[PDB]
Structure 1
Amino acid sequence: SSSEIKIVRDEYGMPHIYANDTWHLFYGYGYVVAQDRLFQMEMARRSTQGTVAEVLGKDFVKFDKDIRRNYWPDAIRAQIAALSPEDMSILQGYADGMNAWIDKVNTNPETLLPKQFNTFGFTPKRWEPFDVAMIFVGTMANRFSDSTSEIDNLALLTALKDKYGVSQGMAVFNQLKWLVNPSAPTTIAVQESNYPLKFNQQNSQTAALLPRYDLPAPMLDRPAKGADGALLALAAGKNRETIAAQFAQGGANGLAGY
């Protein structure tokens, strides 16, 4: 049927959705996600939109501000508003599917409400296309494709120039944080191709143009976590000291790592 959605789960409980149009297919997907992972998805939603403190309290206020400061929701909404009917159906069907199960949950919470909602003291609300998009946008883009430490690098460069003088400071910066290194093992062999844009020390003009930077490197202000993976919610001062100690000890592999 046009209206029919068939959900088959295998022996490991993995769902297979059978539907005849885009909206129905993604509705089936959202429905099974709400069945399997409603608490996880709710918390991911709050994580991606900076609404964790609303249910977990004061320890997540800085976290919520940091999430909100790192994106511009109206721009995401304008992207969604521009979608063709077929593309919008993916997001809307998904949200609509989640909602159908969420409504069933809030109608018979005694057996269908994930236990964690009782433990954390709140109940799940409906999803919109923006919420679905924000799971992705807030994870893959705003966190995992948003890596820069240029202000920290400027802080390090200011210190290197102070220790070694201007040209040597810059040359030591190039030794520690090279632009490119021809001996790096590359996924594509050099026999196949090479990147046509040649970046080198010689031509740079912008490093000379900036102000000497003396505030604390911003990497020291990321919210510190402990061994359980929980946020420590520290004073600004103890946070910086925790990150420095964690980073000196474990670097990128450690607690204050990447």
Structure 2
Amino acid sequence: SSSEIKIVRDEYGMPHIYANDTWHLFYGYGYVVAQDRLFQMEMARRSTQGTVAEVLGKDFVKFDKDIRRNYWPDAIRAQIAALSPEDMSILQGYADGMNAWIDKVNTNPETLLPKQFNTFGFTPKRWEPFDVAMIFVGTMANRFSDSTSEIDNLALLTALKDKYGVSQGMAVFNQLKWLVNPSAPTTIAVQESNYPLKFNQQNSQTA
């Protein structure tokens, strides 16, 4: 009963997991994911860790380098090691559930191996907590929450000061890339609140 996991799929195939502790719940989630989306997940793993060229060849080398250059994997592993047992059970259970299905796939590939592994010429390997963490970390953090263009911005500012002079060039930068614009529509109305901080807008860090 502590060992029991019930999986129910609805009429669109959506799975519902029933279990009695954290590890077992996330194990059922990992299991259904490996049934439904194993190739997609494997390629997301490779995308998030920069191991695509291993299977797809030379056209993905620069890609892989760029992914590895943008994170510090040992730091992610240190955050995992600091987790409480309860938190670790989410990641561990998920990995363990995917592996239960991957092991079934690799034992009877003639009927269970997604066709794309045969097309692309490789077979799936097991997962660990770090890999599950990196699906999130490599999508939501390292790509989606990682946006800056400050080096390009400085090159535009330098070009604007060369064209217009130091003062007008800074002011034209403030016209093209304003720090804040009070007419911007805001999700929170001004009657509710406003942000209390005011920022330097003339590159005073190098003044």
Q: Same fold (TM over 0.5)?
A: yes
TM-score (norm 2): 0.97
Q: CA deviation at 1:185?
A: 0.3
Q: Deviations over 1:7-33 (max 9, x none)?
A: 000000000000000000000000000
Aligned residues: 204
For residues 9-88 of structure 1, what are the structure 2 equivalents within 5 Å?
A: 9-88=9-88
* Distance in 2 separating the partners of 1:158 and 1:44: 39
Q: Would the alpha carbon gap of residues 202 and 161 (structure 1) be closer, same or farther in structure 2, given more than 3 Å must change?
A: closer
**8 Å Cα contact 2:4/2:19 also seen in 1:** yes
**8 Å Cα contact 1:33/1:98 also seen in 2:** yes
Q: CA deviation at 1:199?
A: 2.5
**8 Å Cα contact 1:180/1:199 also seen in 2:** no
Task: Find the residue that maps to 1:143 and give its secondary structure.
Answer: helix
* Distance in 2 separating the partners of 1:163 and 1:187: 37
Q: CA deviation at 1:155?
A: 1.0
Q: CA deviation at 1:202?
A: 6.4
Larger RCO (CA within 8 A; separation ≥ 6) = 2
Q: CA deviation at 1:188?
A: 0.3
- Higher mean alpha-carbon deviation, 17-26 vs 160-169, is at 160-169
**8 Å Cα contact 1:180/1:200 also seen in 2:** no
**8 Å Cα contact 1:26/1:94 also seen in 2:** yes
Structure 1 gap ranges (5+): 205-258
Partner of 1:173: 173
* Distance in 1 separating the partners of 2:173 and 2:202: 14
* Distance in 2 separating the partners of 1:106 and 1:202: 60
Q: Deviations over 1:158-213 (max 9, x none)?
A: 11111111111111000000000110000000000000112253694xxxxxxxxx
- Higher mean alpha-carbon deviation, 154-163 vs 32-41, is at 154-163
Task: Find the residue that maps to 2:160 and give its secondary structure.
Answer: helix
**8 Å Cα contact 1:6/1:17 also seen in 2:** yes
Q: Which 4+ residue blocks in structure 1 deviate beyond 4 angstroms?
A: none
Q: Deviations over 1:132-159 (max 9, x none)?
A: 0000000000000000000010111111
Partner of 1:112: 112
Q: Would the alpha carbon gap of residues 203 and 147 (structure 1) be closer, same or farther in structure 2, given more than 3 Å must change?
A: closer
**8 Å Cα contact 2:170/2:202 also seen in 1:** no
* Distance in 1 separating the partners of 2:196 and 2:93: 43
